[PDB]
Structure formats: C-alpha cells, structure tokens
Write a protein that binds this ligand. Structure first.
Ligand code: HEM
Ligand code: HEM
Lengths: 363, 362
C-alpha cells in the first residue's frame, strides 16, 4: 500500500510498475482564460501531491467550518496511498486554445482511420486526460472525482473508463497478467528498469523537435471491445494460432517457457505477435499499459467486455501507427473491434514541490 | 484465502464481506424443467471448482486442440480470493417449470416507493448469482464462465460490478466508506451473531415455505448518487443528513463510531434515525452492498452510487418497512433508486453430491 514518488524528470504512471486498477478520465476545457487554466494546473498539481501520498486534498475531508463543503470528498479516508499515480496528458484539441497552436508537437500525430473501427466520438478524444492507477479502485476513483470537482467551471469530464484489472507489465520479474481472452498480456513490453530502452522508445528528447516535451511521452488510448461469444466457441488451437503463443504457459509456438524468445517464422503469418513484434515493424516498440474492462451487458443476453489499450511511445508516428497498420491482417481482428480512441502529449515530470503540471508548455 | 462452498447455508451472506462484487441477473430461456435441473447441477459442479481457485470442467488448456477450452482461462495464476457464489431465484422463475405454488410468500414483490426511477432493463430477473471476491478478475471470470456454461438455457439480463475496501492495505475490522465519504456498515448484523441471523436473516421451516429453510431473501437496489450536488453541501448539511459525523462516524453527541445512537439528538428525517430498528418495530437487515462507478453520464457527471444488497428472513418484515420509513429521508435529495430486484436465496449445498436448488426441484 506504499507510495510511488510523485516528482521526477518524468511523470510517474508510465515506467512505474503497473498497478492493479485504472480510472482514466478525458476532460474538455471550458475556459478561454489562460491565467485561469494555469491556476487550475497548479491547484491540480497540489492536489496530486496530497493524493499520491494518501493525504486529503486542501484543508481535508472534515473539521473545517461546519457551513463549508469539505475540501476533500472523504471516500479515501483510512485508506493507504496504494501506489496511486496521476499522469496528465494534453490532447491535440488543446492547442487550439490559450495561444498554444505553434506548440502542438509533430509527434502528437492524429491517427489515420483503421479498417474495422467503429469509434464512438463521445468516448473518443479530449482536450486533456488524467490517468489514475492504484491497487485500490476507491483510491483511484477518489482522485479523479476530486480533480474533476476542483476543475468545476474550467474543465468537464468528456468520458471516462474504469479498468478493473491490468493487462500489461513493466516488471518482467513478476507474473504477467491475463486479459479476458485468457492469454498473458505484457510478456515482451518495456521494463521500468530498462533505462536505455525507455530513452530510445518512450521518452521525448529535445532534438526530436519539441523542447517543452523533453522527458515527456506520447499516449494512444484505444477502447477495444472483445467478441467474447465468438472467441469462446473457438478451439484451443485456433486461439493459440491467433496469438502465436500457447495459452497456459504463454510461450512462443514450439517453445517451453513464456520468456523464451519468439521464433516468428514458426507462427501463422497473421499471428498477432508476429505482426506486432518490433522485428516486423522496422524496430518500432511500445510501452503497453492497458487494463480490462466490463461495462454491464449488451442488451442481447451477454456480458459486454473488452480491453482499454494504452501505449506510450517517443513518437506516435514511429510507435503505434506503424504497428497498428501492420495489424490490418491480424487474426485477432476477427475477435475485437476498436470503439474508442484518443491521443495525448504527456508532459515531463513535476521536478519538485515548486513545479506544476504543464509548466514547460505554459511557462 | 478460501471460503468453504458447502454448508447448511450458502456462503456469501453471513461469511466475511469480500472487497469486490460481480452480480449478475439471468433470465431463463428453456421451458424444460429437466434441462434446467441439469444446468443447476453443472453450475454447482463449476462453483465448487471456482471457489477453490480451480478451472471449470477439464480446464483452460491442455485439452484436445480442436475443442474449445472448458474454462476461458482469465483466472489462471490467481488465487481463490475468498470467492463465494450465491444463487437466488426471482419471482418470475416460479411461473416456469410448474412452480407457481412454491413461490414463497416471504418473496414479496416490492411496492413502488416515492422517488423510484427504476430501469426495467436493469431490474428483475429469473435468477441471480452474486460473485464476491477480493480480486475482481476472480469474480468476473466466475460470472463469465457460469454464463457460458448456461448459454442455450439462460442469458444475462443485467450485471453490476462493485467494490468495498482493499483488504491488502485496509484493516479488516475497519468500516468501509461509501462514495458520499461516510462509514457504511457500523450497525449491521455480523456473521458471528448466530442468534440475530436466526431471528432476522434465515428462513425457518415454520415460516411457511419448507424448501427455503436455511435460505434467505435478497433485495437488490441500484442507487445512483448525485455526487456533484452532495459535494456542494456543507459538512454540517452532510452530517445532518445521516445523524453521524463524517470523520469518526459517531452518532451526534457521541465520541466513537460504535457508541450506540441517541436517535432524538438527530434531525427527525436523518437517515440513521429513520432506518434504525427502534423506528421500525424492531425490523433489522443484513446489508451487504458495494459501491459502483460505471463511468460518466452524458452530461460530464460521475456515474456513481451504491449497489445496495439486503438479506432478510422475510421481505415484508425487513426491507419493505425500513425502505417505507425512508419516504421522508434527508438523503433522498442526493440519491435515486434506478434498479431493483428480489430473490429467494435457497439453503446451502450440503455436500459434494448436492446441488443448487435441490430443495425446490426435489
Ligand atoms: C484486445 C486487444 C489485444 C489483445 C487481447 C492483445 C493480446 C496480446 C497478447 C496475448 C500478446 C502476447 C504477450 C506479450 O504481451 O508479449 C500480445 C503482444 C503484443 N501486442 Fe497485443 N493485444 C491487443 C491489442 C494490441 C494493439 C492494439 C497493439 C498495437 C497496436 C498491440 C501490440 C502488441 C505488441 C507490440 C506485442 C509484443 C510483440 C512482441 O514484441 O513480441 N496489441 N498482445
Ligand atoms: C446510497 C444509499 C445509502 C447510503 C449512502 C447509506 C448510508 C448509510 C450510512 C452512512 C449509515 C450509517 C452507518 C451504519 O450504521 O451503517 C447507514 C445506516 C443504515 N442504513 Fe443506509 N444508506 C443508503 C441506503 C439504505 C437503504 C436503501 C436502506 C434500507 C432500506 C438502508 C438502511 C440502513 C440501516 C438499517 C442502517 C443502520 C441504522 C441503525 O440501525 O443504526 N440504507 N446508511
């Protein structure tokens, strides 16, 4: 239930070990006052420092003036930090505001349209995002609820997503979690200890073209519905052939152990792993950081479930875009549908107690 | 680690409250009584496996390559996680299989309550399965696999994910808070309270329905919270709504959470004053609910609330009087009941040969 340090060269919640739970919110900005938006960023940063240490925001959750609404809504009283991280990103639509147009990063690329997509516009996009991850869902929900509340009048929640369980790993020494298709997801990712690979594939560098984003990263989010009925009547072999790994151990086809290296020519040519692997994509590599979701039933007698896919990369054009384009013939396509999308530029870290989210962008 | 599946009573009622919930209501599609009994047996066999952390059937892998796996595999590598699976039978079930005359009188339909705004699509159901565990993926895997075993005979009508505390980092003794920020569960019925369970929770044979002896009756209410309105209320306003203070959760005028309330010190329409047994002719409930958050609604606001569950020996003498007494509750400003269902939760699976519903079906 320990704390993850909030300050750094980088924002936490990226290279950080992946926590069990997610509460992801996309916000739209409803103020045209740049000073008022800067004030909100600083208030949010102050709140995030309290939240990530397990403390109540502002003057607390009780013991103020009886006639005042409490500054903190109280539902995380008595809980631990629970490895809460709070990661902010700026969507491309933000840059149309506050005189920011010339500061939109080129690496913050709008995605192309992909075959098969049915994107819900209402649950897509956003001027900004906050990714809350924690081992306790109440802790994550408290954090989002309180940031939204602080932002009342200046931002609104466009759309949100709860992730009930992780489907990703930045810690290859630890058990790889399974997605709702029953396969381990995150075996060949990027570990938080692999500083060279993080610098190569995840962190923006000044020389890339956008100084304010040095030490930041770029995020793609995709809400991916799973066709659970269709998958569950597939044979074991068909399932394994879809991925290129066996189900129980998660080893590449033909191999004994999960972490043995793929031999891609032994996989079907439309196997997900074969198509996704960096060696199939000119070296393109991602830090995947997604979670499973369920959002009731579909009105047709079935559970509604999926995977909320999150990828961090140094440049959207060299990371998600080439990989996803290469999945055009993926065997997995028969079992999924992308139904939500958004991109964000995730700024560098909050250096110390005097810094604030977005300071390098806004000055 | 694991909670025994077998007993005089189903687990998941009196047994310790786990951190997470996946509750599903099912509608029955078969008209064939024998086919439904066969499903109850297959479900019981699966539940035995699930509650011990094992995959259903022949497993999640290693079978014949050309066969779909019996278990969908998303709980491989996880723990039993104190999973309990509790089945219940809705009033609508009894219109099937010739059962009309074995519907319990204690399984009463709820009246319309003031301020109800019930979504019929997220209300009712022929059956329910309450999956409670500390790991939400364990719960969801159970429901998903039961639904898959059932497909052809039952469908999922509605489902609800929920959460309480996270017990790895939160003391078990500690009362959880709801999303209004108040402690919720201080004055309840405990699993240790064997006599209170017999008085207020378990159906007795003498009550009129022999098949239900050792069972209980369940009321589910999906209760939306008006978070943004609540969060604009003053601290005094919030405490006045409940009759307890927010930080300690002590009754007004008292020092400690567990100090017994003086009801007359609370406002007349305070929640605790209206809900207390002394205000309801002694009517007492076993509350077993969970918070939810589904998302954002369409207007920027938080789709959050309380999935309220109450167990009782008779709906007519438990939930109905208490909820009736909340007609004037100060809390009503901040909540709305948007879903509802009732179930008759049969007695326990006695041993390895028994099956869910055996006392009803014979
Ligand atoms: C519901 C959707 C998806 C499911 C169920 C899924 C499942 C999996 C599984 C089971 C693995 C193998 C274990 C591992 O992580 O190494 C894997 C690998 C991977 N996936 Fe996905 N995936 C999905 C979507 C995507 C998307 C949208 C992308 C990128 C656009 C992606 C990129 C990758 C990458 C890069 C690998 C590692 C390949 C390698 O280097 O060995 N996945 N996926
Ligand atoms: C969102 C809806 C609700 C919230 C936020 C809420 C909150 C609470 C809180 C904070 C308490 C005090 C602590 C405790 O003893 O548990 C309480 C007590 C109680 N509530 Fe509620 N509750 C809600 C709905 C209901 C409903 C629908 C009923 C029953 C029909 C109910 C029955 C009770 C009872 C019987 C008590 C204990 C009273 C006593 O014996 O002292 N509640 N509730």
């Amino acid at each position: 239930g320990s704390a993850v340090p909030f300050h750094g060269a980088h924002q936490a919640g990226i290279a950080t070990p992946v926590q069990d739970r997610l509460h992801f919110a996309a916000f739209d900005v409803t103020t045209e006052d740049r000073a008022a938006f800067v004030a909100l960023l600083k208030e949010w940063t102050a709140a995030a420092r309290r939240l990530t240490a397990g403390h109540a925001v502002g003057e607390g959750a009780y013991g103020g003036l009886p006639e005042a609404p409490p500054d903190d809504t109280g539902e995380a009283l008595g809980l631990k930090p629970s490895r809460l991280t709070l990661t902010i990103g700026f969507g491309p639509s933000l840059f149309t505001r506050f005189g920011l147009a010339d500061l939109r990063p080129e690496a913050l690329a709008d995605l192309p349209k992909f075959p098969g997509d049915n994107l819900d516009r209402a649950r897509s996009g956003g001027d900004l995002c906050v990714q809350a991850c924690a081992d306790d869902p109440q802790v994550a929900v408290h954090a989002i609820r309180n940031l939204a509340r602080i932002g009342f009048g200046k931002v609104v929640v466009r759309w949100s997503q709860l992730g009930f369980g992780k489907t990703s790993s930045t810690t290859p020494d630890k058990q790889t979690p399974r997605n709702l298709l029953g396969f381990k997801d995150g075996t060949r990712n990027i570990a938080g200890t692999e500083k060279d690979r993080l610098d190569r594939f995840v962190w923006a560098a000044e020389k890339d073209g956008t100084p304010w984003m040095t030490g930041g990263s770029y995020l793609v989010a995709r809400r991916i519905r799973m066709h659970i009925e269709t998958w569950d009547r597939a044979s074991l072999q068909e399932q394994e052939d879809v991925f290129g790994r066996d189900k129980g151990e998660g080893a590449p086809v033909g191999k004994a152990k999960e972490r043995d290296e793929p031999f891609l020519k032994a996989m079907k040519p439309d196997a997900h792993v074969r198509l996704a692997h960096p060696d199939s994509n000119g070296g393109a590599t991602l830090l995947r950081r997604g979670f499973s979701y369920t959002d009731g039933t579909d009105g047709l007698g079935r559970l509604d479930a999926g995977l909320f896919f999150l990828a961090y990369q140094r440049d959207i054009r060299t990371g998600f875009v080439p990989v996803q384009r290469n999945l055009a013939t993926d065997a997995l396509n028969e079992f999924i549908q992308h139904v939500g999308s958004a991109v964000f530029a995730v700024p560098p870290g909050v250096r110390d107690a005097d810094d604030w989210w977005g300071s390098t962008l806004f000055g």
